[PDB]
């Protein structure tokens, strides 16, 4: 169902015929979903699963691609009826969605490792009967345009995915599951989660697709492991040049995570001429407060990944401060567990193998440690902040005890005369949080009383 003009690149016998195929689409009114993902999945499964054969680059020669496409198109127009689903005004209606959604889940193999690598795109729905969570929206959204429904589009937290459509292209609906175990809400909205001010749905500050988005996700989407200790560099090098080649003609300039992901490939492999991978950590930062209301949490952890990982204690402790600092809007909420985990790995591995390398060196005489800076002891009561006011109002509580051990370890590892010099205003710092007001004497002793922490950090009503 492939125009001839979407034919004359093929056969595709290099990373660089990839991009091109890429660039030509994106010229496209409206570039070619069921198209790309076929192709990003084959050149995929012969560089990263099975690379028996492989002397350069899998050729993807027309015939393959085009067969591919076949019985996708084929799977997808014999299976939705569409003069049952009546399109009032070039909008489709959430019964078709709810139609297409079926009509993917039901293709796909009942029963496996719904979290496995390479089963992303549609070569992996074609050929193994097998999509991960957001591939499921993905598909859906391909089937979608392959049906003509220029109005379904995809839709993404930090977490999930799910479509919109309709008039204004107003209208949500969940097509896919979330996480493990969680009873499914598909054919619904997604209001109920924006409304309980859940991470998950963002506040309603979720990303909207164009399709030229929903091509940049599909080049996010490329997994290049081999294995754990081994990573494809071919596919490494062909998701680098498609992210500059969508970068260069505008389309992440409202996808943050996208941003952050080209700068952990340049960070490992750097393209002379380009920016520098803080300089697209910021661009991340930037966009999510343009675009989203500085309403995401990755774009932070991203900068404080690249800072923690070059053991920049200073600013990996700023930036987690920052990420806590959004996250203290948000009622922590079944189904939010995913940055429950993030935050509690920060706060209880991450910062404290830090600080205890910062002691180490300390001791071996460095200057200008964040053991010895204010500021920095001030980042890392802001981080506690934060995630303490996250925990007022919500659901669910977020700390306990396991946390609180952490907590006076960490705060042990500045000295009382670097503490007692930040100030905390009713360097200068004003906490947010009730838990963090009560802990303001104690967190400047010389001595710091680790049991009334750790009552004040979790509440705690009584003693032995
Ligand atoms: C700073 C980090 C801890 C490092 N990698 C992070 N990632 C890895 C890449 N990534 C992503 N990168 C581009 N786009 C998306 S869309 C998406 C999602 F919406 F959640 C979906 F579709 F449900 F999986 C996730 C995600 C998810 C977040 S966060």
């Known amino acids: 169902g492939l125009k001839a003009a979407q034919k004359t690149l093929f056969p595709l016998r290099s990373i660089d015929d990839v991009v091109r195929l890429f660039a030509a689409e994106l010229g496209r009114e409206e570039p070619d979903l069921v198209l790309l993902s076929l192709v990003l999945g084959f050149v995929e499964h012969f560089l990263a ?143 109920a989660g924006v409304a309980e001010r859940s991470w998950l749905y963002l506040k309603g500050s979720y990303m909207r697709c164009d399709r030229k988005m929903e091509v940049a996700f599909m080049v996010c989407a490329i997994n290049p492991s081999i294995d754990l200790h081994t990573d494809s560099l071919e596919l490494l090098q062909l998701q680098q040049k498609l992210l500059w080649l969508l970068y260069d003609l505008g389309h992440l300039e409202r996808y943050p995570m996208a941003l952050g992901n080209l700068a952990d490939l340049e960070e490992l492999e750097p393209t002379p001429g380009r920016p520098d991978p803080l300089t697209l950590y910021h661009k991340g930062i930037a966009s999510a407060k343009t675009y989203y209301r500085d309403e995401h949490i990755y774009p932070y952890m991203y900068l404080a990944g690249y800072h923690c990982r070059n053991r920049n204690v200073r600013e990996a402790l700023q930036a987690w401060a920052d990420t806590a600092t959004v996250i203290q809007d948000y009622n922590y909420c079944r189904e939010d567990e995913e940055i429950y985990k993030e935050f509690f790995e920060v706060a209880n591995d991450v910062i404290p193998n830090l600080l205890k390398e910062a002691a180490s060196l300390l001791e071996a005489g460095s200057q200008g440690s964040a053991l010895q800076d204010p500021e920095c002891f001030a980042h890392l009561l802001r981080f506690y902040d934060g995630i303490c006011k996250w925990e007022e109002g919500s659901p669910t509580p977020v700390l306990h005890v396991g946390w609180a051990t952490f907590l006076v370890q960490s705060l042990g590892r500045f000295e009382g005369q670097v503490r007692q010099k930040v100030r905390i205003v009713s360097p200068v710092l004003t906490f947010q949080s009730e838990k963090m007001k009560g802990m303001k004497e104690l967190l400047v002793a010389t001595k710091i009383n680790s049991s009334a922490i750790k009552l004040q950090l979790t509440a705690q009503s009584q003693v032995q």
């Open 49 to 191: 699963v099975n690379r028996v054969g492989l002397t350069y680059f899998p050729v993807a020669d027309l015939s393959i691609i085009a067969a591919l496409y076949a019985r996708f198109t084929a799977q997808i127009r014999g299976a939705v009826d569409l003069s049952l689903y009546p399109r009032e005004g070039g909008v489709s209606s959430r019964e078709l969605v709810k139609k297409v959604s079926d009509v993917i889940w039901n293709s796909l193999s009942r029963s496996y490792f719904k979290d496995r690598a390479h089963i992303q795109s549609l070569f992996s729905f074609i050929t193994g009967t097998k999509l991960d969570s957001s591939g499921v929206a993905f598909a859906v959204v391909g089937a979608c345009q392959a049906l003509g429904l220029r109005d379904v589009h995809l839709a993404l937290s930090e977490d999930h995915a799910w479509v919109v459509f309709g008039p204004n292209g107003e209208q949500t609906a969940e097509v896919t599951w979330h996480g493990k175990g969680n009873e499914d809400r598909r054919g619904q909205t997604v209001n």
